[PDB]
Amino acid sequence: LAEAIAAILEGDVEKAVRAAQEAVKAAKEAGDNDMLRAVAIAALRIAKEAEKQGNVEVAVKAARVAVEAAKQAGDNDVLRKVAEQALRIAKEAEKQGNVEVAVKAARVAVEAAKQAGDNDVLRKVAEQALEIAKKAAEQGDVGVMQKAMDVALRAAGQA
Amino acid sequence: AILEGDVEKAVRAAQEAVKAAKEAGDNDMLRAVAIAALRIAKEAEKQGNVEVAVKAARVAVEAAKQAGDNDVLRKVAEQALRIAKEAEKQGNVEVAVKAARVAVEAAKQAGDNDVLRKVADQALEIAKAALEQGDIDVAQKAMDVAVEALTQA
Structure with missing residues (x-):
């Protein structure tokens, strides 16, 4: 966490993730709820x-x-x-046109939403999953669209 | 039947019309049936x-x-x-996806890529409605039809 805070000062996000991977490794070995909470909040600010x-x-x-x-x-x-x-x-x-990263972001979002069971989140997630799939269809990449289908449809299948 | 609005009779007649045309191997009746x-x-x-x-x-x-x-x-x-x-305005997403199932079958013969694109766009509107209804089997069908629409591009 200290290394990650130093990375938050320094701005090397790859270094930050390298630290965070070890941070979750330790935290998962410990099973400490607050340590996990801290790692998650740190990851959130790293992402911000x-x-x-x-x-x-x-x-x-x-x-x-x-x-x-x-x-x-x-x-x-x-x-x-x-x-x-x-x-x-x-x-x-989506704004960058990186639909591959957008579909991975959805793949993460639905994983979390399935644990949470928050219905408004689930519907907002599925809504954006269709928006992502729409832009992936505007790009027209068939294999990406098979994933965009698979994710958005699985999300709807939980929601 | 069209002038009467008795459109079931028009559907019935069309089915027999293609039956006759196909059993004969008719060279052009197909065109009339489609225009009708x-x-x-x-x-x-x-x-x-x-x-x-x-x-x-x-x-x-x-x-x-x-x-x-x-x-x-x-x-x-x-x-x-x-x-x-x-069909979407009527909320009948099941009829909407079957309309798209016909649309892609025909577009696959024609090779109109902009039609295939428009079919996929429409299939996304159908999927949005299917999600909003929770008709997720119809979303599955809409996704299969979209896979056809993409794969034939």
């Missing part, structure tokens, strides 16, 4: 900074750690914050 | 009942796939899209 930098790719890598922790912890409001941020990240990935 | 199906669909939209319109379009593709009249296929696809738009 990565969005200011426009680095949606590393933001999704951070979100992948965030769900890894949150799935153990069951902090419902943290799962909500994560899901909201995952959609914010996906919206930037 | 376009008229039937136009009226079925004014009558609101898209389920007749799709059953008529079912005959329309059965014929048009023999015939290869490109402008007729294009008109038929346009009508199938219009039928889907009305």
Whole structure:
């Protein structure tokens, strides 16, 4: 966490994720709920900074750690914050036209939403999943669209 | 039947008409049947009942796939899209996806990539409605039809 805070000063988001991977490794070995909560909140601020930098790719890598922790912890409001941020990240990935990153952001968002069971989140997630699929259809990449289908349809299948 | 508005009788007649045309191997009756199906669909939209319109379009593709009249296929696809738009306004996503199932069957013969694109766009509108209804089997069907619409591009 200290290394991650130093990375939050320094602005190297790859270094930040490298630290965060070890952070979840230790936290998952411990099983301490507050340590997990802290790691998740740190990952959230790392992502918030990565969005200011426009680095949606590393933001999704951070979100992948965030769900890894949150799935153990069951902090419902943290799962909500994560899901909201995952959609914010996906919206930037749409604006960048990086539908691959956007679909990965949805894949994370639905994973978290399935733990949370928050119906408004689930419907907002599925809504954006169709928006992502619409833009992936405007790009016309068939294999990406098979994924956009698979994710959005599975999300609807939970919602 | 069209002038009477008794459109079930128009669907029945169209089915026998293609039966006769196919059992004969008729060289052109297909064209007349499809042009009549376009008229039937136009009226079925004014009558609101898209389920007749799709059953008529079912005959329309059965014929048009023999015939290869490109402008007729294009008109038929346009009508199938219009039928889907009305079926969505009626909230009948099941009829909407079956309208798209016909649309892609025909567009696959025609090769109109902009029609395939418009079919996929419409399929997304259908999926949005299917999500909003929780008709997720219809979303599954809409996704299969979209996979056809993408894969044939």
